[PDB]
Amino acid sequence: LMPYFLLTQAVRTGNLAKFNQVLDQFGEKFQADGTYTLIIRLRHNVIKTGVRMISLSYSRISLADIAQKLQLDSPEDAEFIVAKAIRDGVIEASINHEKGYVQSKEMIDIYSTREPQLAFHQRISFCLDIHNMSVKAMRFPP
Amino acid sequence: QAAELFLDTVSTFTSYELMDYKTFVTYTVYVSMIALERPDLREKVIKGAEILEVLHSLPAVRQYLFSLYECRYSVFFQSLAVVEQEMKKDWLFAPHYRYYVREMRIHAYSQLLESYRSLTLGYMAEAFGVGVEFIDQELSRFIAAGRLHCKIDKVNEIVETNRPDSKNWQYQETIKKGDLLLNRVQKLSRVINM
Amino acid sequence: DKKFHGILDQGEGVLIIFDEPPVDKTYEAALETIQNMSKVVDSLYNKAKKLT
Amino acid sequence: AVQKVVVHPLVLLSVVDHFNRIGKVGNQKRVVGVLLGSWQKKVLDVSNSFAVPFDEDDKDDSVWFLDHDYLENMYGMFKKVNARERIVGWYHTGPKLHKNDIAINELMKRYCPNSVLVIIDVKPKDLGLPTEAYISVEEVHDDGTPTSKTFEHVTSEIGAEEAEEVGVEHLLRDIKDTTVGTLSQRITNQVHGLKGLNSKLLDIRSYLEKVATGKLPINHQIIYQLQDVFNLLPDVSLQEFVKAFYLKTNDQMVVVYLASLIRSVVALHNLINNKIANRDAEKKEGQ
Amino acid sequence: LLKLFTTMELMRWSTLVEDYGMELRKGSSPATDVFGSTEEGEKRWKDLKNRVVEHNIRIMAKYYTRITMKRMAQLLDLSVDESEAFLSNLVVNKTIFAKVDRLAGIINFQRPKDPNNLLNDWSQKLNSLMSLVNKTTHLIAKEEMIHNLQ
Amino acid sequence: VIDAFRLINANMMVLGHEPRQTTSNLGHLNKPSIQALIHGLNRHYYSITINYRKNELEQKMLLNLHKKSWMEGLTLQDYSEHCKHNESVVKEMLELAKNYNKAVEEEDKMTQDPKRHLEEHVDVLMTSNIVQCLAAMLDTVVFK
Amino acid sequence: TRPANHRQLTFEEIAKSAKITVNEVELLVMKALSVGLVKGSIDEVDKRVHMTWVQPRVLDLQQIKGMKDRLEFWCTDVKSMEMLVEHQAHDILT
Numbered sequence A: 001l002m003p004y005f006l007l008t009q010a011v012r013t014g015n016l017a018k019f020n021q022v023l024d025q026f027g028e029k030f031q032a033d034g035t036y037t038l039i040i041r042l043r044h045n046v047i048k049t050g051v052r053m054i055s056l057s058y059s060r061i062s063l064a065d066i067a068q069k070l071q072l073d074s075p076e077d078a079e080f081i082v083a084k085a086i087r088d089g090v091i092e093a094s095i096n097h098e099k100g101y102v103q104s105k106e107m108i109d110i111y112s113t114r115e116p117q118l119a120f121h122q123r124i125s126f127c128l129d130i131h132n133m134s135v136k137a138m139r140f141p142p
Numbered sequence B: 001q002a003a004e005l006f007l008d009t010v011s012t013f014t015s016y017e018l019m020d021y022k023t024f025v026t027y028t029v030y031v032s033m034i035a036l037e038r039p040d041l042r043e044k045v046i047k048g049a050e051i052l053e054v055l056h057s058l059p060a061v062r063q064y065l066f067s068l069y070e071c072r073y074s075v076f077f078q079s080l081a082v083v084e085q086e087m088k089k090d091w092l093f094a095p096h097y098r099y100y101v102r103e104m105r106i107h108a109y110s111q112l113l114e115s116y117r118s119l120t121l122g123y124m125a126e127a128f129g130v131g132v133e134f135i136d137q138e139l140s141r142f143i144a145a146g147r148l149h150c151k152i153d154k155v156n157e158i159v160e161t162n163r164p165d166s167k168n169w170q171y172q173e174t175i176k177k178g179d180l181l182l183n184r185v186q187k188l189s190r191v192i193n194m
Numbered sequence C: 001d002k003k004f005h006g007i008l009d010q011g012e013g014v015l016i017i018f019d020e021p022p023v024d025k026t027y028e029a030a031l032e033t034i035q036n037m038s039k040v041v042d043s044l045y046n047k048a049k050k051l052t
Numbered sequence D: 001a002v003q004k005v006v007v008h009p010l011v012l013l014s015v016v017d018h019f020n021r022i023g024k025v026g027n028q029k030r031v032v033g034v035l036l037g038s039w040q041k042k043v044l045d046v047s048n049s050f051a052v053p054f055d056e057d058d059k060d061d062s063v064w065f066l067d068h069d070y071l072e073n074m075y076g077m078f079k080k081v082n083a084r085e086r087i088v089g090w091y092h093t094g095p096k097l098h099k100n101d102i103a104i105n106e107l108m109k110r111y112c113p114n115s116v117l118v119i120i121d122v123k124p125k126d127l128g129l130p131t132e133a134y135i136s137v138e139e140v141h142d143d144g145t146p147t148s149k150t151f152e153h154v155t156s157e158i159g160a161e162e163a164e165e166v167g168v169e170h171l172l173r174d175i176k177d178t179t180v181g182t183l184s185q186r187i188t189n190q191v192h193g194l195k196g197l198n199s200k201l202l203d204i205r206s207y208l209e210k211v212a213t214g215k216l217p218i219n220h221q222i223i224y225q226l227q228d229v230f231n232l233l234p235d236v237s238l239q240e241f242v243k244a245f246y247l248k249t250n251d252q253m254v255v256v257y258l259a260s261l262i263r264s265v266v267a268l269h270n271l272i273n274n275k276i277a278n279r280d281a282e283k284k285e286g287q
Numbered sequence E: 001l002l003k004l005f006t007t008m009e010l011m012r013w014s015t016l017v018e019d020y021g022m023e024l025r026k027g028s029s030p031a032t033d034v035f036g037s038t039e040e041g042e043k044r045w046k047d048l049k050n051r052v053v054e055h056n057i058r059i060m061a062k063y064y065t066r067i068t069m070k071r072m073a074q075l076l077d078l079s080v081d082e083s084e085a086f087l088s089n090l091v092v093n094k095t096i097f098a099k100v101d102r103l104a105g106i107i108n109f110q111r112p113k114d115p116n117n118l119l120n121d122w123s124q125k126l127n128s129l130m131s132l133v134n135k136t137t138h139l140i141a142k143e144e145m146i147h148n149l150q
Numbered sequence F: 001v002i003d004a005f006r007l008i009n010a011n012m013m014v015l016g017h018e019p020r021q022t023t024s025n026l027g028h029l030n031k032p033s034i035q036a037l038i039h040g041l042n043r044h045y046y047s048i049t050i051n052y053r054k055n056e057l058e059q060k061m062l063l064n065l066h067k068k069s070w071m072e073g074l075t076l077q078d079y080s081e082h083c084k085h086n087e088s089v090v091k092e093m094l095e096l097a098k099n100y101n102k103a104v105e106e107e108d109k110m111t112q113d114p115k116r117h118l119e120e121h122v123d124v125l126m127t128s129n130i131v132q133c134l135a136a137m138l139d140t141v142v143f144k
Numbered sequence G: 001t002r003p004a005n006h007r008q009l010t011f012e013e014i015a016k017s018a019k020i021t022v023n024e025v026e027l028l029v030m031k032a033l034s035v036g037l038v039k040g041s042i043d044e045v046d047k048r049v050h051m052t053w054v055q056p057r058v059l060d061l062q063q064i065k066g067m068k069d070r071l072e073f074w075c076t077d078v079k080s081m082e083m084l085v086e087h088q089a090h091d092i093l094t
Helices: A002-013 A016-025 A027-033 A036-056 A063-072 A074-090 A114-137 B002-008 B022-034 B037-047 B049-057 B059-069 B073-089 B095-115 B123-129 B131-144 B166-193 C025-051 D009-025 D068-081 D101-107 D160-172 D185-212 D222-231 D239-286 E002-007 E011-018 E020-024 E042-062 E068-074 E080-093 E113-149 F010-015 F033-039 F055-063 F070-072 F079-110 F113-142 G011-016 G024-036 G059-088
Strands: B152-153 B158-160 C006-009 C014-017 D004-007 D032-039 D043-051 D086-092 D118-121 D131-137 D150-158 F004-007 F045-048 G008-010 G036-042 G048-054
Touching: A002 A036, A002 E020, A016 A027, A027 A036, A036 A063, A036 A074, A036 B131, A063 A074, A074 B073, A114 B166, A114 D222, B002 B022, B022 B037, B022 B049, B022 B059, B022 B095, B037 B059, B049 B059, B059 B073, B059 B095, B073 B095, B095 B123, B095 B131, B123 B131, B123 B158, B131 B152, B166 C025, B166 D239, C025 D239, C025 F079, C025 G024, D004 D118, D004 D131, D009 D032, D009 D043, D009 D118, D009 D160, D009 F055, D032 D068, D043 D086, D068 D086, D086 D101, D101 D131, D101 D150, D118 D150, D131 F045, D150 E002, D150 E113, D160 F055, D185 D222, D185 E113, D185 F070, D185 F113, D185 G059, D222 E113, D222 G059, D239 E113, D239 F079, D239 F113, E011 E020, E011 E042, E042 E068, E042 E080, E068 E080, E113 F070, E113 F079, E113 F113, F070 F113, F079 F113, F113 G024, F113 G059, G008 G011, G011 G024, G011 G048, G024 G036
Parallel strands: D004 D043, D004 D150, D086 D118
Antiparallel strands: B152 B158, C006 C014, D032 D043, D032 D086, D118 D131, D131 D150, F004 F045, G008 G048, G036 G048
């Protein structure tokens, strides 16, 4: 996995130069495994990774600030990138270009809602099914 | 474990062949600060007779420890910088200075935010004796890494504190532990039913 | 130091003093039973995966 | 007045037997008897009864021959057998009242000031008790309406002596239910509760239909109680209630999840033991 | 005066003074020494004001959930600060339960609502509703059975 | 504990003939009481078989005794008491889980009450919690 | 008249009702509660009144037809929930 370790380091650092040099150095292993289409969709989701980290560690950051942090060209480009990230649901936030800032969803206390019920329902049904399978598989050979 | 052993053997240090008592006490202080919560730290270091006795001779280690304990954060970063230099020079801690400084910075940030629901970045920067860009960058890095329970808000610089409620934390822990146990149960059942 | 149940707020400049709901004991017992059953499942692994 | 009346299994069985024997010898819509019991505060305990000869003209609707002499003779002999049982009312096995009920209650009030009618329906229903209790009250209606001597409902219940509980349980031993909540029976009980609620709501709606169209007059106590019911209906869309409801549902579901997880682990252990036992048995048979 | 102090409603101190001042303090039917004009008269006047304010605060806590300070001041005849001090003293003494949201002045007599308590109130409402519908159907059966007979 | 009887004529018993004919298997299947034997069950009298004539209407009337009301069918347990009971039983089930862990470990290392008690506790927890959850659901729907 | 769903009466509503400006709807509601006509509380911060009761009175045939309609709805809902539960649990009903 060392080539992929280098790839992950390059993407996390967000540096196209290191990403490209890693790709050029370890293309052979990438032919052997088969990821090139995935490894360019990578570059795409590398800028996506930048925006996702920004939205993960912020609540009301402005478009100019997003652009500066991601080293994008203009707040216009940053606005496009973040809006598409919203569309793809990788940051799961809102946006507001009246004042040019991306707002995040108002985090809600997720225990007075049906998500705990749904999770416990899945797990309860799974446990019931396991018990039924076990008590069925119980066999008596004569 | 280093904190546990060092604090258990601090009052009866006999191994002078490794290091003098002063160096051993500095190691105990550093490791205890990075490993122990605030209550245990106060009970076993700030209120430690044999540690205070040597910290009288050691005026910088004392300033470090008490700057952290008494929530004096500018002095704390000063002491942490000097500790980073000392402990880079050190030979046993040498491959730990970056990690230790990072963890102590995270501890200081969590400690400051532990008693706040919404802390303005200006106040945080003034408290830590740094700029606003510095605190913003550090907070963003540690929140992204998942080490701090706080969300920044830069358009109007404010650091909201999204600590999880007791019941919410309990629910999340139940989900995690139950997922692990259920994976084990599923594996065992599929191994045995066939 | 947990001397009283309150939290500051450096925004409006306020001290929100509240009453912290008690730590639910049912979840504590549930988590302890979860770990106990996990080690029980480890024992069942030792039994079956090694005797079958 | 009397706030409660508790009838007994012996009274119910005696009433049923009386009706059966009378309808076997001949044909009659009602059969009438006296109810013997004791008071403990305003809680009548109808612990016994005895039939009395009685016939009427179902056409005239005002001619009947309840036998007072027979009543007093039977009451005296029942006093001789047991003393802490004085005449506390009467019963008739008619599903509906009649214009003669007020007159017969007037007759019975000579033997008891607080004489209470108890209609014990021999035809077995499925939602409510077989006994309906009535006390004759005649008072100037504060309503300001003409007042007539009519009945007023009295809360009724079925209770049993211990010596009657033993007999009841023995007689029901074959078709008894478990005296414990088994999940299937609890779900069934909830379904029966929904059935009963629906039936009661249907009865109220039918009465409202009749009073609205005009067949019946507006009973002010009925309307007051219905108003209070509609005042008492909860609000379940309230956010502060929805949040607490989800919180409690999640707590119950996590307890259920832990229970099911434990049960599944136990079942897996049982199957591990069974597989090991089968392995041992087949190895031993082979060798 | 006794009737007002026994009634469960807000009696405004200004109106009480206007109506019952001369006849309690300046006399006509003599003026009782209590509420006179000397040290122990004026002090007992302030004591009577305190009793009036205590009555008003009790009535508020009984017929309110969230009353603004802007309103308690006017309805209690004390400045905002005076009313806040009086209510704080009562709260410390543990006579009145009330939490003052001094940032917004949203003085709140609502004790914290445990989900246990909320759902318990809901269940009690449902229990009483079913009992009342049962009683109503019993009386309905009686009414139909009687009047349909006619 | 009820029993019917009739006397045996003094002549028949001495004549060697049995007190009562026996033409069918009915009548037997009853174990005579030791008290009745020691007091002379078969020497002076004999126990007749008691049968009970139960009509369907009578049985339904008897059921009316403890028949539950639709109220109690559709009613909810006190929520504070429910939470207390759940917490108590879950703690007890925790203790039984520790016991059952030690039991399985020791038995499988050297090669029951913990497992059985734990099964009973899980059963009661499941039934109570499910019943109240469903009752709450039904109330929320039905009463609005 | 107001159903239990939205029995949150407002100061403006009571003003548009019996003629009084919104500075003594508070006193009027206090008088009502004290006399015992209604029950509940008054959140004057949000300027609304929560009513959880009313003293029942005598009604009209149309006021009872409205109650009949409300019952019709309630009966329909109860029957639907009954059918749902019975069909779902059919295999475990005793």
